[PDB]
């Protein structure tokens, strides 16, 4: 019976958050993911001189 | 020459199957299984010592045809020695596999110490060492001698012949026929008695199909060894005790009997490997 | 090329040797997993032999070393950690035989036994069913018929037939009778033969394992 | 009381609120990106010392040393470049299901089926390693543990709770209690100010270390989940479940963003990790092999098949040069 008081207090706090439209939150994943593509050795194969393994 | 057709053919058949089966076995045993457990070590060494003893055969094939030893003193000593060597180190692996299996069934609690994959490595090495007690003395005493017809490989023993030529023949008899037949029989003998009283292997119609399969596999192993090894030993001893005038049939019988000896090395992959439960359980 | 790295490689070889030695030493102990319903007899069992999440119990008998883990104090999704224990030599399942009337309880214990026996991880592991409190079963069967717990049962309300019927009820819950064996025993207070029974079952299991390893199935 | 039905109002108010902010179809924003192509990686190492299944793994910040715990009772520290061993710690409880390895490089941690997280000291006088402390106080069993400093460690146990310890004191500073099932994994944000956890409720939550209150809850899985990992930007994470279905959530938009699945996969997932740039998502299955998903178009990009039993741990170095996978095979492979 106490959990009901606790649980409702939780859902109240979680329901008031400033969301943002997903297209805005999806471009940022796109921009970061390509502003680092150069220095990702798994994606672009590395010349054998600089490959420690 | 009908005889020359058969004698050349019989050895060729043995040699080709022996190299084919054995070299396949070493390939599979190391490519996939990679020698994890004690038994897989043993099968490899049997496969190895079978391959070597089979590769000596073709040099014996050409010797029959020409009646002359063309390969010179350089190769004669390295051929005969590797033939006597592989007889003992192939047999002793068979005796070690049997003594191992008997421990693992009739003394289950003490086998927790003897049977470790490190100890399997010691025994195999110690097995090749003890075989050299006959591999090396034949290396030094091997010689090439010119005869009335041509050169033939032969072992010139020592100053006395009546007292030392027979010693090798009698010694190889006891330590390569009597001891092997004895211990692979008793050790496999007592295994089957104990397997009767195992609660896992009795009580159902399907259970006894497993007990039937095991006692067939064990019995086959002893049967092949007896049949493929007895004739040559008895034929050697008899030829050492009486004249046996050289009839065309005597030449036919002798070479065939020798080929029967090498049949043991060809059948070993089918029995010890191609019938192993794990070998089927990976293909 | 390898100036003082040789010292590093030597250190590697030494600790590799120590690892191998410890593994060989620990591969000659026999591990037993002790399930059982809620305090059915599990506390009693560990007394007869020589003698926080789980608690081990190392003991020896006839030059054999047993470790025996019980997991009664581990309250969580059994599915999420039961797979740690595959490869134990045997399961010891402990059942109280005087619980057929108190609360039904036998039905729950049979449900647990069925769940454990046919798990995807214990498809081959042998189990030893121990049946405790046979003494109280004497003067509990006298008044309360076993039909209370087994309505489809027709037989004499005596100890001899009831015990055999219960053992038969438990012993046919394994759906794979051609691969795993179930050992059964009615516990006895004195006459320390319980450990003897465990010894016999474990020796048969070792025999089967060796036969598998040698390549004879 | 009427509360039990009033909570249903809020649970329905939220769903519509986050529905009003969904015009993306991220699969539609990202149709003009050239694909990654094909990824072929080859094992460059194989570390072979363990004698039983291995359950965890963790790289050092050096991206050279790694620690790996198996259930034979040994957690050893390898050396990726020259495949040596620099320590072999024998530990008291043979049942272990986790590892950590401090950012500084001084300590390791290791817990298991005995409810106790042990912190070992490596750089010490007298040579060998010694047990610096044994943290106790959980009731379920340790399932994951991570380091923040050389002084604070955060753990997640099987009794539906997480906690934040203090090492010298040896006591629970804070406790996060919101789940309703077991807690299976854990992941810290890059700035170590808030972490996420994934439970057997098919739900993940987002706490924060300073205060001690969960801020958001993400649902959408059909079954239990076993792995978590932050997107390196600190604004998204991906989870792995027993549906054979990874999926990517977003912290700011506050909902599911894409799902990864394929029809000829019915298996379970045991570990997840992102590459350094975040472009391609690793994931380890019980199929005995781990896939490589392109994290922006959801199509496969290759496989890594080298094990003979299910893979149970996976990790990517800090400088993004290698991946290391371990498995119940008892061996560890370093792909590249
Ligand atoms: C008691 C038996 C005996 O005396 N043998 C061996 C008979 C062949 C059996 C070998 C099976 N091995 C296996 N691994 N299965 C001897 C028979 C004679 N050979 C002569 C060699 C040779 C002969 C001429 C030129 C070069 C070499 C020496 C061995």
């Amino acid at each position: 019976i106490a959990q009901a008081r606790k649980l409702v207090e939780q859902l109240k706090m979680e329901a008031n958050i400033d969301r943002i439209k997903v297209s805005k939150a999806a471009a940022d994943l796109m921009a970061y993911c390509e502003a680092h593509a150069k220095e990702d050795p798994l994606l672009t194969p590395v010349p054998a001189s600089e490959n420690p393994f | 020459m009908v005889t020359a057709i058969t004698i050349m053919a019989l050895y060729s058949i043995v040699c080709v199957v022996g190299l084919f089966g054995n070299f396949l076995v070493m390939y599979v045993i190391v490519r996939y299984t990679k020698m994890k457990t004690a038994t897989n070590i043993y099968i490899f060494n049997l496969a190895l010592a079978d391959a070597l003893a089979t590769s000596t055969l073709p040099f014996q094939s050409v010797n029959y045809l020409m009646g002359t030893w063309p390969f010179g003193n350089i190769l004669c000593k390295i051929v005969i020695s590797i033939d006597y060597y592989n007889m003992f180190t192939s047999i002793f692996t068979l005796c070690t596999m049997s003594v191992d299996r008997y421990i693992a069934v009739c003394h289950p609690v003490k086998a927790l110490d003897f049977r470790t994959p490190r100890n399997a490595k010691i025994v195999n090495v110690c097995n090749w060492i003890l075989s050299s007690a006959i591999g090396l003395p034949v290396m030094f005493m091997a010689t090439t001698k010119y005869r009335q017809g041509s050169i033939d490989c032969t072992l010139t023993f020592s100053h006395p012949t009546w007292y030392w030529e027979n010693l090798l023949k009698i010694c190889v008899f006891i330590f390569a026929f009597i001891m092997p037949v004895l211990i692979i029989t008793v050790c496999y003998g007592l295994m089957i008695l104990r397997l009767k009283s195992v609660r896992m292997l009795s009580g159902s119609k399907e259970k006894d199909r497993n007990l039937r399969r095991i006692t067939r596999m064990v019995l086959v192993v002893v049967a092949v060894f007896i049949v493929c090894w007895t004739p040559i030993h008895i034929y050697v001893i008899i030829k050492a005790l009486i004249t046996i005038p050289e009839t065309t049939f005597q030449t036919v019988s002798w070479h065939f009997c020798i080929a029967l000896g090498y049949t043991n090395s060809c059948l070993n992959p089918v029995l010890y490997a191609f019938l192993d439960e794990n070998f089927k359980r990976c293909f | 090329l390898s100036a003082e790295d040789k010292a590093a490689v030597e250190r590697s070889k030494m600790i590799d040797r120590n690892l191998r030695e410890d593994g060989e030493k620990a591969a000659r102990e026999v591990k037993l997993l002790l399930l059982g319903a809620g305090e059915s007899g599990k506390s009693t069992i560990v007394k007869q032999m020589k003698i926080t999440g789980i608690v081990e119990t190392h003991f020896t008998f006839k030059d054999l070393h047993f470790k025996m883990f019980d997991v009664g104090g581990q309250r969580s999704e059994r599915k999420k950690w039961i797979h740690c224990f595959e490869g134990v030599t045997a399961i010891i399942f402990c059942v109280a035989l005087s619980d057929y009337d108190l609360v039904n309880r036998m039905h729950e214990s049979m449900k647990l036994f069925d769940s454990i026996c046919n798990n995807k991880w214990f498809t081959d592991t042998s189990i030893i069913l121990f049946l405790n409190k046979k003494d109280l079963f004497e003067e509990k069967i006298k008044k309360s018929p076993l039909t209370i717990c087994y309505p489809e049962y027709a037989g004499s309300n005596t100890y001899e037939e009831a015990a055999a019927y219960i053992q038969c009820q438990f012993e046919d819950l394994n759906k794979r009778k051609d691969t795993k064996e179930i050992y059964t025993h009615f516990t006895c207070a004195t006459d320390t033969k319980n450990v003897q029974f465990v010894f016999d079952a474990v020796t048969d299991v070792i025999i089967k394992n060796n036969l598998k390893d040698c390549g004879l199935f | 009381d009427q509360l039990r039905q009033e909570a249903e109002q809020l649970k329905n108010q939220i769903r519509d609120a986050r529905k009003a902010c969904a015009d993306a179809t991220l699969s539609q924003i990202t149709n003009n990106i050239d694909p990654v192509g094909r990824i072929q990686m080859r094992t460059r190492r194989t570390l072979r010392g363990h004698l039983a299944k291995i359950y965890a793994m963790h790289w050092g910040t050096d991206s050279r040393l790694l620690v790996s715990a198996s259930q034979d009772g040994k957690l050893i520290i390898w050396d990726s470049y020259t495949t040596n061993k620099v320590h072999a710690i024998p530990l008291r409880s043979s049942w272990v299901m986790t590892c950590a390895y401090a950012p500084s490089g001084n300590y390791v941690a290791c817990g298991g089926l005995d409810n106790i997280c042990s912190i070992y000291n490596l750089k010490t006088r007298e040579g060998n390693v010694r047990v610096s402390r044994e943290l106790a106080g959980h009731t379920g069993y340790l399932s994951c543990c991570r380091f923040l400093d050389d002084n604070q460690i955060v753990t997640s146990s099987g009794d539906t709770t997480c906690a934040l310890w203090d090492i010298e004191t040896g006591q629970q500073t804070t406790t996060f209690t919101g789940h309703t099932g077991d807690v299976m994994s854990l992941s810290l944000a890059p700035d170590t100010r808030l972490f996420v956890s994934g439970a057997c409720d098919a739900s993940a939550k987002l706490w924060d270390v300073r205060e001690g209150m969960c801020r958001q809850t993400f649902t959408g899985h059909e079954s239990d989940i076993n792995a978590i990992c932050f997107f390196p930007n600190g604004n998204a994470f991906a989870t792995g479940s027993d549906d054979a279905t990874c999926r990517l959530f977003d912290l700011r938009a506050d909902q599911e963003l894409m799902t990864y699945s394929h029809d000829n996969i019915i298996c379970g997932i045991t570990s997840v990790s992102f590459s350094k740039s975040g472009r391609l998502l690793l994931a380890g299955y019980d199929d005995f092999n781990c896939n490589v998903w392109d994290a922006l178009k959801a199509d496969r990009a290759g496989v890594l098949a080298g094990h003979d039993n299910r893979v149970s741990c996976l990790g990517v170095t800090d400088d993004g040069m290698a991946v290391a996978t371990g498995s119940w095979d008892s061996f560890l492979k370093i792909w590249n």
Side-chain angles (χ1 to χ4, degrees), chain B residues 39 100-101 104-105 108-110 112-113 115 118 194-195 198-201 204 206-207 210 213-214 217 275-276 278, chain C residues 20 27-29 62 64 171 177-179 182-183 199 203-204 206-208 210-212 214-217:
Chain B
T39 285
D100 169 43
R101 284 175 180 170
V105 167
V109 61
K110 314 312 320 183
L112 289 185
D113 291 331
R115 297 182 82 245
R118 177 137 177 286
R194 174 82 170 94
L195 280 192
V198 165
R199 189 193 181 283
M200 172 45 237
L201 286 167
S204 173
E206 180 48 1
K207 288 193 192 165
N210 288 318
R213 204 183 35 80
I214 286 171
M217 181 175 338
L275 277 195
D276 186 76
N278 291 300
Chain C
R20 167 188 71 75
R28 69 170 60 95
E29 305 206 320
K62 273 191 217 183
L64 206 49
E171 191 154 349
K177 293 194 178 68
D178 286 324
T179 308
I182 295 187
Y183 306 80
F199 187 80
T203 52
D204 283 8
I206 298 180
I207 296 289
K208 174 168 65 58
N210 293 343
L211 275 194
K212 269 202 197 318
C214 284
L216 313 177
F217 196 74

Side-chain angles (χ1 to χ4, degrees), chain D residues 3-20 22-27 29-31 33 35-125 127-209 211-212 214-232 234-307 309-336:
Chain D
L3 286 179
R4 54 221 71 201
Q5 73 84 0
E6 190 277 331
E8 191 56 20
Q9 213 44 41
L10 292 175
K11 177 142 51 203
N12 206 6
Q13 181 206 332
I14 297 169
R15 189 165 33 87
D16 298 338
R18 76 176 57 174
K19 175 58 81 203
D23 51 358
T25 49
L26 179 56
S27 302
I29 293 175
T30 304
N31 65 4
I33 299 301
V36 183
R38 284 293 301 269
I39 295 292
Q40 293 82 17
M41 292 177 207
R42 264 162 290 288
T43 66
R44 315 284 191 183
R45 294 289 195 274
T46 304
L47 315 172
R48 314 151 91 101
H50 275 301
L51 295 156
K53 314 194 262 197
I54 77 177
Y55 270 86
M57 192 267 301
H58 198 197
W59 287 94
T61 68
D62 299 330
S63 50
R64 198 190 163 128
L65 305 160
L66 74 164
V67 58
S68 86
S70 59
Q71 273 199 350
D72 53 352
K74 278 303 166 303
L75 77 132
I76 73 215
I77 297 185
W78 306 86
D79 172 15
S80 297
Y81 288 7
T82 67
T83 183
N84 291 321
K85 321 182 171 41
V86 304
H87 282 112
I89 309 154
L91 71 165
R92 287 138 182 201
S93 163
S94 176
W95 318 100
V96 56
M97 311 155 48
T98 185
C99 284
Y101 183 76
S104 59
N106 292 296
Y107 304 84
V108 303
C110 166
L113 212 59
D114 52 326
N115 311 70
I116 295 176
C117 198
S118 314
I119 294 89
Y120 294 80
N121 183 359
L122 300 188
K123 314 273 191 51
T124 177
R125 297 134 296 177
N128 55 353
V129 300
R130 77 165 85 266
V131 178
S132 185
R133 198 163 304 276
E134 291 192 303
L135 316 177
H138 264 307
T139 303
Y141 57 75
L142 277 296
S143 171
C144 199
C145 55
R146 289 302 193 237
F147 267 96
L148 294 174
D149 302 350
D150 284 338
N151 199 358
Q152 317 177 78
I153 176 178
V154 62
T155 72
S156 79
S157 178
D159 67 342
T160 80
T161 60
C162 300
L164 193 141
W165 307 80
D166 190 339
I167 290 182
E168 293 82 3
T169 300
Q171 287 181 256
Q172 273 186 329
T173 298
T174 312
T175 315
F176 319 94
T177 69
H179 275 298
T180 64
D182 299 335
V183 187
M184 291 285 128
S185 66
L186 194 72
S187 179
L188 285 163
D191 54 61
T192 62
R193 198 140 297 277
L194 73 168
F195 67 92
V196 292
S197 51
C200 305
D201 297 2
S203 75
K205 297 199 184 288
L206 184 143
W207 321 87
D208 53 351
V209 290
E211 293 82 3
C214 77
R215 323 264 304 284
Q216 296 155 236
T217 303
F218 310 100
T219 60
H221 272 289
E222 320 195 323
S223 299
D224 189 358
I225 70 172
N226 306 341
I228 301 298
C229 197
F230 272 100
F231 194 79
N235 285 334
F237 59 91
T239 81
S241 55
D242 299 344
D243 313 337
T245 303
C246 298
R247 58 184 64 190
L248 187 153
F249 301 92
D250 186 74
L251 274 69
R252 292 192 287 167
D254 202 74
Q255 86 255 33
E256 181 156 60
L257 193 62
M258 181 165 327
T259 183
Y260 308 97
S261 73
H262 189 273
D263 291 331
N264 63 7
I265 289 177
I266 60 165
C267 184
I269 296 188
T270 46
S271 58
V272 169
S273 173
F274 268 110
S275 175
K276 175 170 165 86
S277 45
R279 178 57 183 252
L280 72 165
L281 170 61
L282 281 296
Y285 291 82
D286 305 333
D287 276 3
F288 302 171
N289 66 341
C290 66
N291 281 258
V292 172
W293 299 93
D294 163 75
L296 283 186
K297 291 175 133 286
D299 44 30
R300 277 154 86 158
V303 299
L304 279 69
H307 289 287
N309 212 341
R310 63 154 75 166
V311 305
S312 65
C313 54
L314 187 150
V316 179
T317 62
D318 274 349
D319 56 57
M321 191 75 78
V323 298
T325 66
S327 62
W328 296 3
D329 192 13
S330 87
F331 302 115
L332 202 142
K333 306 192 123 192
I334 298 180
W335 314 74
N336 192 11

Side-chain angles (χ1 to χ4, degrees), chain B residues 49-50 53 56 59-60 63 69 76 79-80 83-84 86-87 90 153 172 229 232-233 236 254 258 261-265:
Chain B
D50 278 332
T56 299
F59 304 150
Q60 294 175 356
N63 184 294
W69 191 227
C76 178
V79 161
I80 293 173
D83 184 48
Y84 272 94
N86 287 173
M87 171 181 328
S90 163
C153 279
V172 66
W229 272 103
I232 187 61
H233 280 86
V236 162
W254 161 268
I258 282 290
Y262 293 116
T263 315
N264 183 208
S265 281

Side-chain angles (χ1 to χ4, degrees), chain C residues 3-5 45 175 193 202:
Chain C
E4 87 181 6
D5 292 331
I45 298 298
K175 304 315 197 182
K193 305 138 58 185
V202 162

